[PDB]
UniProtKB/Swiss-Prot annotation:
Disease connection: Hyperphenylalaninemia, mild, non-BH4-deficient: An autosomal recessive disorder characterized by increased serum phenylalanine, normal BH4 metabolism, and highly variable neurologic defects, including movement abnormalities and intellectual disability.
Domain J: 21-86
DNA-binding recorded as keyword: no
Tissue-wise expression: Expressed at high levels in brain, heart, and testis, and at reduced levels in kidney and stomach.
Induction per the UniProt record: Up-regulated by ER stress.
N-acetylmethionine, modified sites: 8
Official protein name in the record: DnaJ homolog subfamily C member 12
Organism: Homo sapiens (Human)
Keywords in alphabetical order: Acetylation, Chaperone, Cytoplasm, Disease variant, Phosphoprotein
Function: Probable co-chaperone that participates in the proper folding of biopterin-dependent aromatic amino acid hydroxylases, which include phenylalanine-4-hydroxylase (PAH), tyrosine 3-monooxygenase (TH) and peripheral and neuronal tryptophan hydroxylases (TPH1 and TPH2).
Binding partners and assembly: Interacts with HSPA8. Interacts with TPH1. Interacts with TPH2.
């Protein structure tokens, strides 16, 4: 004989997340390696690429935060600084601090 049929697993969790964590953007952590951090950035970035979806401008943002974070992480030097700022939970955002580190002068006027 021959019979059988099953597949009632129609349960998924695609909830959203309201947070601005450079680590969340790529869904990785200190454990994740550079190679991987890039792979996810490519798929996650392409899946929401602006060029592809010219009708959806907002997308640009998602790609802007994906390319930025991916960089700050990919580089052990830049990342190292990020973590430090976290453990210190400074009042100002990493962005600001970053500038201070490089130079104690006004760097990057374009904010938005």
């Amino acid at each position: 004989g021959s019979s059988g049929s099953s597949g009632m697993d129609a349960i998924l969790n695609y909830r959203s997340e309201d947070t601005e964590d450079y680590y969340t953007l790529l869904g990785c952590d200190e454990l994740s390696s550079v190679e991987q951090i890039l792979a996810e950035f490519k798929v996650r970035a392409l899946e929401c690429h602006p060029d592809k979806h010219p009708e959806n401008p907002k997308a640009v943002e998602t790609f802007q935060k994906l390319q930025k974070a991916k960089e700050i992480l990919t580089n052990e030097e830049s990342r190292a600084r990020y973590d430090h700022w976290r453990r210190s939970q400074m009042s100002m955002p990493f962005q600001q601090w970053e500038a201070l580190n490089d130079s104690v002068k006004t760097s990057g006027p374009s904010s938005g």
